[PDB]
Amino acid sequence: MKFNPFVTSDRSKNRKRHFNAPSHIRRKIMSSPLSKELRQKYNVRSMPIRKDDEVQVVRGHYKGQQIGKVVQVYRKKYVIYIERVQREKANGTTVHVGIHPSKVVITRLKLDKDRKKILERKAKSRQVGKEKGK
Amino acid sequence: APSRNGMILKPHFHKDWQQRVDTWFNQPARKIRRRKARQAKARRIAPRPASGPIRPIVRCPTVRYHTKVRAGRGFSLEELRVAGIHKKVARTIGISVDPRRRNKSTESLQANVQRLKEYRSKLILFPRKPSAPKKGDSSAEELKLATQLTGPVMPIRNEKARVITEEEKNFKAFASLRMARANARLFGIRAKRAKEAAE
Amino acid sequence: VSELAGHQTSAESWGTGRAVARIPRVRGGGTHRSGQGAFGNMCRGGRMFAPTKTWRRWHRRVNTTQKRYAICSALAASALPALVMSKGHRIEEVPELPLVVEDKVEGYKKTKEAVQLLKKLKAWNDIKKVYASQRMRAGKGKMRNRRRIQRRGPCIIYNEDNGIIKAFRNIPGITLLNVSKLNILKLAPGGHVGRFCIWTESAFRKLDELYGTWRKAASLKSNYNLPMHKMMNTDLSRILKSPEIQRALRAPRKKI
RNA sequence: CGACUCUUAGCGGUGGAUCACUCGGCUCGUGCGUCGAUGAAGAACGCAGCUAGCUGCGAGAAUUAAUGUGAAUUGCAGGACACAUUGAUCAUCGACACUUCGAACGCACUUGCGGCCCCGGGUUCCUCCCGGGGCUACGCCUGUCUGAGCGUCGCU
RNA sequence: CCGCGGAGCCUACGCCGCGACGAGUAGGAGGGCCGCUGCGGUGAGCCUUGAAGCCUAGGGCGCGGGCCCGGGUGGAGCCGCCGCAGGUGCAGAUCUUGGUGGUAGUAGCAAAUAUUCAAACGAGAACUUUGAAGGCCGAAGUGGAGAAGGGUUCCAUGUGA
RNA sequence: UGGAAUGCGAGUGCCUAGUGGGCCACUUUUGGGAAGCAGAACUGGCGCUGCGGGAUGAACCGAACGCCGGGUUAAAGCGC
RNA sequence: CCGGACCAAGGAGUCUAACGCGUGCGCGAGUCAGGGGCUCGUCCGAAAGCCGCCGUGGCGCAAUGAAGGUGAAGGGCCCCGCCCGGGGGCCCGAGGUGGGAUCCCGAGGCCUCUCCAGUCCGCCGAGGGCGCACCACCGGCCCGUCUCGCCCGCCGCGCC
RNA sequence: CGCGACCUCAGAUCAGACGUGGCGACCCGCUGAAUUUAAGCAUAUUAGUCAGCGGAGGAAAAGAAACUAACCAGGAUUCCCUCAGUAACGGCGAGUGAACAGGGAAGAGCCCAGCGCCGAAUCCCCGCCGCGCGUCGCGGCGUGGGAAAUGUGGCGUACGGAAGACCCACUCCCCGGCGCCGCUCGUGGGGGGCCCAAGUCCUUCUGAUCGAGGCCCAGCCCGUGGACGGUGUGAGGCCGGUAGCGGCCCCCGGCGCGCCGGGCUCGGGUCUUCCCGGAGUCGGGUUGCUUGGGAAUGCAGCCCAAAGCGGGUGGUAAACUCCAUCUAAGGCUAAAUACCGGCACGAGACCGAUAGUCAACAAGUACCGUAAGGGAAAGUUGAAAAGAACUUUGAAGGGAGAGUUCAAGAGGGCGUGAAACCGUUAAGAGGUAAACGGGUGGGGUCCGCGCAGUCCGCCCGGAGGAUUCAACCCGGCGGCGUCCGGCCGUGCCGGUGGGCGGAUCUUGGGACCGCCCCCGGCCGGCGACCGGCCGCCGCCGGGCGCACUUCCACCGUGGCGG
């Protein structure tokens, strides 16, 4: 149970912060779990979703084992777009269906200097916690 | 307005009292704040007793209360002088000083003097510079037995059977009290009539 | 409510002669508000009848002797299995209702050992019923930061902390209580006596010094002793069936 | 027989009650407790590729720089950022910048009229014309300079 | 005792018996397993296999306050019991806010003389435009320009909500 | 021999709301020509109360009231 | 007579303080921490617990007088110079009268298969006895005030 | 009659500074009503309150006795409890109304003028140099200006002080620039940034789940984390978070310890001799306001107008006398206290869009008034726009199909969708306006696992099946009761007790008393208190008992009871 007198448990305050969060806070809010194989390789459980990330949908109408590429992270709408997750309008054109990143699993993450750095930070912090518990 | 038996009540609610109403919902908050101030002060003056300086013994000034003894504002200049403590070094030692208190009697003077001597013997004086001590206290009593006092320093707090002798048995307690009150009342006019009779 | 609520407008009655009620009305023009009622408990936008005030008496003081009486009654009821089961506390397979466990529990540090101990004392079914009682509160309290409700589980009475509070903290329903600070709000959860309590032996032995026997006054409280009984034998059946009472009776009149 | 009228039920409508919800209030409590002639509060007018209002900003105008962050913003478009020859966005914010009124300050409140000292361009020390820059308000303190007085005196 | 056995009971704040009585404004008192909202306990309560709410020629209960069930609609919460606390029950107040009728397809669209023929555009013309007639303001004008005040109403194109 | 008859269980304390405009009738009665006028006494009534009868009606006559079945009456009636 | 065309939603004895009576609870000649303080950062907890070497204080436990002031013991049994009423000694510890729930004794009755002589318990019981609370009445004590009258005491001999 | 000095004034766009205005919840100084109550009304009350004016700060104001008291005396201010609805005031009516003592929170004390001593020892400005240098201090020099003898500085202020003589101890300090570490104990002291656990496992429901079952070990996994949000519906383990004296990075600090530089480097007792105070102020008269202050509590205007063993106070005016207490007319000072404005936070038995702030929304907005000012209404498609392509009629609005969606009985003021009012369909009725109460009757919608009507126990037969039963033996578990033991105990003695109290005695320590607990012995009772023998009874399991016993189902239009 929360003990910090400076952290709010209020419904309205937590919802207000969520719904008009700045863009860089919406980045960490829109995090997705890594795959079991990736969680084994890097000692990390979840990463913030990013464009050109290979994910699969685990909930909803478009659930399946297909692997798609993230093509748009609409942080204002709190949704991401995947390659094959789409439907047809009345006209005939095709539109992407927004999927919340909490409902997808990263199977391959785009790798760069910044992403390697925060993968190592999350593994180092977790390893310290495991050592402290032991 | 009145209905049968009752009390003639005069409530003082004719003066727009609702604008000046003191609620005490902050009472628990001011207890914690007062408590944390005490704890911070005690740490800041850590070796010192954290209950303020030593106060003298004082008698309450009225018939209702002259059988009781409480703490005064400070030791008077007469008892400080008898104890041999300079009035400008008492405050540094931890002795409260009240320059405006008089000493009508000697027992109260001697009681407060002995209270000052007991404090001086019980006092540990740390050197100004720990590396170089001079006219202070020894290492045994300083870094081994120094503790901060918790409550007030030297708290101030408030006849065998015998055979009754024939003299006090034949004592007129009520009669003496009656003549005594008459003697005080009639003292002035008895002397004036005696002087007039002399003339 | 706010002291200014319903009274920030400027509004006067139109008086009689205008074929309308004599309620105060907003002055001016050029808006819906003009001519509308104000300053009244019957008017939309007006103040309430007797506006609630902060200097209502919120707090009650109970006599110390009565508060101590309530704690003794709550403790006595917690030792009767019928009263504890009447609270729905699932006391079966529990070896003794005045459950006393050693002082090693006070030194517990992991929630795993807290759960294992409850399983070994057969007090885990109480936690399972607390889990089964977790549901959503009905009403406006969901918007008032009181969304979830659940039933109460066992109360654990300790003497020294040594980590016992942290170990049992995460288990739902469990309340931790210091024997020297016994709280009637946690021993009779809803004014009903009969809450299941688990004691450490240190808290159990401290309990005689706290409230005293009938031969000894309380040692840890100055000037307190246990309340006296106004009726020594409460067994009505045995008293009525005793030969002394039966011999003094007239024959019963069964004929209708 | 209709029509018309009345009642009841079904369905459909002038209507927006009830219920459920709530990035809003109200009340209590805690910590801080900081405006301004270095120009405040408050006004006015402007500023976006398409943008009226709200919001943010001031001619560098829906923002510059810096630091942290680390791949977006998004209603459409356009092009950055090659996503280290170090940086989209957002946050923070200590650098820079900050139109006209306003205690409001050259005089006056009309885009009115000046004065002094400099700079550039026409002509050449007309400072005549145009443009730019710095000063030019009241009260009051210490000091400074210039003064007044048949004020009190000294030497003449 | 060849039968080894014999209904129900007694939430004692419960159950049973007997006798008499029953109007009511103002007003007083009692009971309420009458109703509304929130809190503490409790129902190993109910609920997307369908909560609240709403409708009902359905089945019923209670003297009543009201309540339970069936059916339809709805789409996410709700209720029972022991206590606690109220901003807790409306036909009135020329009550407040909103919505709606009958009146009623009614009153009315009657101050300053007046319009007609043809064509054009157009889905559509008594009312627009062009032409031709008949009339009016009749220069102290129904003319041509300004001051206040208005502030884009000025001009062109398009639309006909 | 509980010192007439008859009937009935009494006594007592605290707190206490509403009311403090009345009106009608037999008898008695004051002012007034008198009044469905004004003012009194006693009792009953209406107000607070419905029910049968007086066609109708605050007060008259009868009778006072929980929801019902049978029987019988009061005052008043029994041409329709 | 006045208000009401119709429907929905809102809409009026509340809160605080002070008294008074009644009732539930705790303790009881006492009772009450409410202001303050001590206990881990305090989800709950702004709660709860404890102070007694915080009961200061409030109310109650004493009244009366304007005030100076004064300030609540009754009975039973024996003895007495003196016969107007007071003194002395023991024993207890608010008196007496009439009512008075309840409680106690109880002549005489009821009886276990029968008679007799016993031990009991119960039940009815005429009569008595101790009498709760409360009521009425009569005594008594404290304070104020008035009338009458004789004494006593002494660091003050007093307008005590 | 020129040149100087001083004095009193003046001007300057002179060199440097400072004030103004705003906010105003809390605070300080003024000014200041009436509504109201008195059942009328004028004093009174409302009330020194609202409105008006001025001035600040994070607090303000107050404040170290010209005090209280009368005691065995206390001892600055401020705040809380009490004093106290009291003393007192009041058409003594209505009403108003403090203080001292006592208990707490906090606690802290000091400085001039005057009298004196010291060659003005003093201060501001301007330069230069050595410095130091976060935006400015030190030392020197100045044959550099000015202020100040019409009085700066050091010592010293009622608690007395100073100066000499004697004795004693001998100095324990401050500031600026630098390094150490605990980097403030609530864990770093504070600010900022980035991180740190466990199911989305198997089977099912759904439009979508976060739903419902299950997960060997006695129980899925973590739990110091089961607060809360988000996510297609309800989530401890999907995500952010949450817990943790958890980790890492940057910055800003204070308190202590060490280095350098600068300043100062002096006290305490006893004796002797000296010095010692704030004036148009106090006080008195009078007037007006104010106060609980009453022959005047406080404040102010005018008149009078001091003293020094004096003056002020001692709650009834005055004279005389005694006593007590303080030392006015100059000044500074933190804490405890206040806070409806501001910047950040936390929470709630509060409201839930006619409520709650006027304002949940482009709200102090639209709009109104010349202006001061007045001042609204207005939330909700859907999980996702997937917001209806295309065909067709119409000039279009608007329809018919088609399509999306779980759902258009969700189609851009679109959740649900009541009533009033209306349209249509179905049924019924209709000349005393409708409507109503009580009785029936007719018709209609729905309802009744309605449409051959009950169901239990015992007995009687017929025929079928299977066996334990009845008794006996073994094992297990219960229920009941001088037999024993451990307890729970009153009382009663012996104490290794060694304990708590006491307004008992002491000869702080002790003795004495009363209890409390414990030890041993004796002594009574089982029920919210335990065992073990010995019986008696009951139940269950197993064996034997192998059929006139026992049990299970069917039939009879069976009999009795309900």
Give structural attributes.
part of a larger assembly; 3 chains; B: 199 residues; two-stranded antiparallel sheet; 7 helices; C: 256 residues; alpha/beta; 4-stranded parallel β-sheet; 9 helices; RNA-binding; ribosome; Mouse liver 80S ribosome
Structure, explained:
The structure is cut from a larger assembly and holds chains A (134 residues), B (199 residues) and C (256 residues). Chain A has 134 residues and is of the alpha+beta class. Helix content of chain A is 32%, strand content 24%. Chain A has helices at residues 11-19, 23-29, 36-41, 113-133; strands at residues 31-33, 46-48, 54-57, 68-74, 79-82, 86-88, 94-96, 104-108. Chain A is globular. Chain B has seven helices and two strands. Chain C is an alpha/beta fold and 256 residues long. In chain C, 28% of the residues lie in helices and 10% in strands. Chain C is built from nine helices and eight strands. In chain C, the strands form three sheets. Chain C has a four-stranded parallel beta sheet with strand order 3-8-6-7. In chain C, β6, α5 and β7 (175-178) form a beta-alpha-beta unit. Chain C is extended and about 90 Å long. Chain C starts with 10 loop residues before the first strand and ends in a 9-residue tail after the last helix. Chains A and C meet through loops of A and loops of C. Chain C binds five RNA strands through α1, α3, α4, β4 and α5. Chain C: Component of the large ribosomal subunit. May bind IPO9 with low affinity. Interacts with RBM3. Chain C: The modification Phosphoserine is found at residues 237, 242. Chain C: The modification Citrulline is found at residue 247. Chain C: This is Large ribosomal subunit protein uL4. Chain C: The modification N6-acetyllysine is found at residues 53, 206.
The shape of chain C is extended
Oligomer: part of a larger assembly
Helix content of chain A: 25-40%
For the largest sheet of chain A, list the strands in their spatial order.
5-4-3-8
Secondary structure tally: strands of chain C: 8
Give the strand tally of chain A: 8
Give the amount of beta strand of chain C, in percent. 5-15%
| Major pleated sheet of chain C | 4 strands, parallel
Task: Report how far the terminal alpha carbons of chain A are from each other.
Answer: 23 Å
Of all protein chain pairs, which has the greatest interface, and how many residues does each chain bring to it?
A-C, 4 and 4 residues
* Order of strands across the main sheet of chain C: 3-8-6-7
Distance between the termini of chain C: 66 Å
Number of helical segments with 4 or more residues of chain A: 4
- Gyration radius of chain C, to the nearest Å? 30 Å
Percent of residues in helices of chain C:
25-40%
**Shape category of chain A:** globular
The secondary-structure class of chain A comes to: alpha+beta
The number of helical runs of chain C is: 9
Structural class of chain C: alpha/beta
PDB class: ribosome
Keywords: Mouse liver 80S ribosome, Spondyloepimetaphyseal dysplasia, RPL13 (eL13) mutation, ribosome
Entry title: RPL13 (eL13)-mutant 80S ribosome from mouse
Chain A: Large ribosomal subunit protein uL24
